[PDB]
Amino acid sequence: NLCPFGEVFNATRFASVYAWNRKRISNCVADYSVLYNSASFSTFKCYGVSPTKLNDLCFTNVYADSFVIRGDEVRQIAPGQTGKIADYNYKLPDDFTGCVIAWNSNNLDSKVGGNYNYLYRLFRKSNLKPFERDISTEIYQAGSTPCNGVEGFNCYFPLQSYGFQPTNGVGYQPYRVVVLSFELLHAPATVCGP
Amino acid sequence: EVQLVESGGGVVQPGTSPRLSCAASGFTFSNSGMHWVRQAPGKGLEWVAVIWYDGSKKYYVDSVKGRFTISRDNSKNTLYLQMNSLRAEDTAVYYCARDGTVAVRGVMNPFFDYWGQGTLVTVSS
Amino acid sequence: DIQLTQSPSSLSASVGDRVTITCQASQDISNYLNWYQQIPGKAPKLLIYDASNLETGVPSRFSGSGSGTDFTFTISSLQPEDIATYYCQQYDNLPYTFGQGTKLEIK
Ligand SMILES: *[C@@H]1O[C@H](CO)[C@@H](O[C@@H]2O[C@H](CO)[C@@H](O)[C@H](O)[C@H]2NC(C)=O)[C@H](O)[C@H]1NC(C)=O
């Protein structure tokens, strides 16, 4: 079968940071080969299962989250790491049992004239719980003098655009992050290598 | 090849509104607002005011709210600040610094990366 | 309403000594803070943005860390050049107060 990873790797579209797709794969053999051999991977960090032994473990469910984030802040996608991403829009469980892959992709997202297409969550009322989607548009409400659905001194739109340019630098420039999560359940295991 | 030039200060009498103007050397100026900070003569520095992405938001210091008017001429790629009124505490040096995170549509540069030069605005009669 | 407070407010370390200055902020500030290099009558420029990374151009000796409500800024081997004042500022909440200031001296 050899279920492809290109559906989540080489797809031209990417939910910015919060509409991140949650694609589950089943009844296949990943083979985890191209994931390790490729030398273009900026970051390849795994927790728990060692990188070499992935093919030897037969799980039952595998999730492949995908998105893009500021290049400098890629480190924030890790267990037990707080900041302005994990704390507001996409948090990972402390006892995580998966891998995270980060690519440097400038030629594909940083347009010469500038790109403002990709959105970014900044403001929220309460902290975020692990593995939850927070697609939202309601205007931020500071509290006292809560205004209404309008922009004012205390009231702000809880979204922003990265504003990518070709020559921002190593940081502040597109990165492409894919998080592979493995889960084992009482149901029979199906996903593993040769 | 980035730098910023300020001017429009000096001996200023009370009740006047001199034009404190600063301009940029070269970049996508229209896509990056800025801020103005004030350096007390020997104490420290707090602020002056803010200018947003498309001249939309105009925030000021609470202590001096409603007095200063800060505007931007995008065509000239310059920023102007006027002085509606003065007290004895406005004897500082004004710096104007660019932005690029949590200040403008599009995060490009780290907050307060360059600054540049200064203008002395001591007020007396 | 944000209030900043730098504990030391004055240092005098040896040329080859490691100086670990600190910055404390009220409420929560998350991961938005910067440190500055105020030489008398000069632009403060920048060393560390987000309190976790050094801007491209500053010497690699300096470093920073911290989160939540507390941050630390470490200088490894300060040369006689590094005798400027240092300020810590947050930029998260619309009122972005500016740190008090810490005069650096030589023993
Ligand atoms: C996505 O596209 C890239 C480039 O077209 C593929 O890169 C592969 O890299 C391997 C070595 O790592 C080489 O065989 C080729 O450069 C590419 N393979 C093929 C078959 O073209 C990448 O493999 C694609 N994604 C996936 C999941 O295969």
Residue numbers in the entry:
A (entry chain A): 334 to 527
B (entry chain H): 1 to 125
C (entry chain L): 1 to 107
The authors write:
In this study, we created 494 monoclonal antibodies from patients with COVID-19-convalescent, and identified antibodies that exhibited the comparable neutralizing ability to clinically used antibodies in the neutralization assay using pseudovirus and authentic virus including variants of concerns. To gain structural insights into antibodies and the SARS-CoV-2 spike, we performed cryo-electron microscopy (cryo-EM) analysis of complexes with the proline-substituted stable spike. Accordingly, we performed local refinement to improve the density for each Fab-RBD portion, which allows fine modeling of the variable domain of Fab bound to RBD. In this analysis, the Fab binding location to RBD is roughly classified into three locations.
